[PDB]
Amino acid sequence: RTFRKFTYRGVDLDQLLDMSYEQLMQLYSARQRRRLNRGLRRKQHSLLKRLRKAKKEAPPMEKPEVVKTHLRDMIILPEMVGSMVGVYNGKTFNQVEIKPEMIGHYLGEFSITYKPVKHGRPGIGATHS
Template sequence: MSSEVKTKRRPFKKFTYRGVDLDQLCEMSREDLAQLLDARARRRFQRGTKKKETRLLKRLRKAKKNAPELEKPECVKTHLRNMIVLPEMVGNVVGIYNGKTFNQVEIKAEMVGHYLGEFSITYKPVKHGRPGIGATHSSRFIPLKIIKRLFHNLRLETDSLILDIIKL
């Protein structure tokens, strides 16, 4: 019984996209690949690829070709958030613009068929801190906070005036 357990090995799960291996996806023509993608991506491919998209693919191929063996290729920056991830892009590093910075993303096989913009978030998730002045009913009745809020609205930045008023 223990010998049976030792002989069982868990092989790595090979990636398939809708039943097709990644190697076969890379060899497919764009028309055949479009038939495997969802309807939105199919419509996009029917309209044809734009000049900017072909230029990005050319730069990605060049970066992958110039990369030393067993190392990641150089990052290729782009503003094309609406570019669909193709199988030939797998393994590349893309800097996707989020409106402020370029987020470096390594393209993996699981990303095929998705938009580049899905992997570079455009907003900063909210981190809820302590409530501000006047945010709750209990904080309204603290006189010092009310005076500070009034002076803040008047753009008086000196705390000495506030302290003088409190002493009166």
Template sequence: MDPQEREAPPGEKPEPVQTHLRNVTIVPQMIRSVIREYNGQTFNPVEIKPEMIGHCLAEFSISYKPVKHGRPGIGAIHSSRFIPLKRVHGGKFKGHPMSLCFYQNSHES
């Protein structure tokens, strides 16, 4: 990219350059330029600033959708293994883990 070709009049942004190269290291000659970086679906505009020198372009255009964890579904075996499935002491267990401790301690005396 030749800086003289992409210069814009004062107060305007230069014409963006489109690229698929996400592993390009940002150098000082790229400051104040606009690059449209491909993230796998769309071209995201990235304006190069002095703080970005030395970083890769991929760091400024996320290529995945962040995970939003919801409630466990039907197949959630991992989370349901902490819920007791059997009745304790003839069905007198109330369902709360602390009630089991109080029930056992009350019959020890």
């Protein structure tokens, strides 16, 4: 909290916003670079359009409206930061804050698909001889 620098790969968020796709390919790691170099299809662009619209329609100095999606394989782009995304579990839409320091990840790893297990008592034949 002492310093306010983001510095993703040595570059902070402003020139990391205005920089195009073809050099933040070089900025990312191998899997995200291959996803970006390969085609980024229609529904991903529709999600980005909805995120931009909900961002610019937000009144100043509060959070934008939550945007739901099934696309839990979207790369979290720098364009997406500070947004309000509901990511599907199969069952529910989970509220996720797109923080600046999650820009190399998928949306799927912020909405957990299962309930973590706490064990009951081993039932009957659970312990053999």
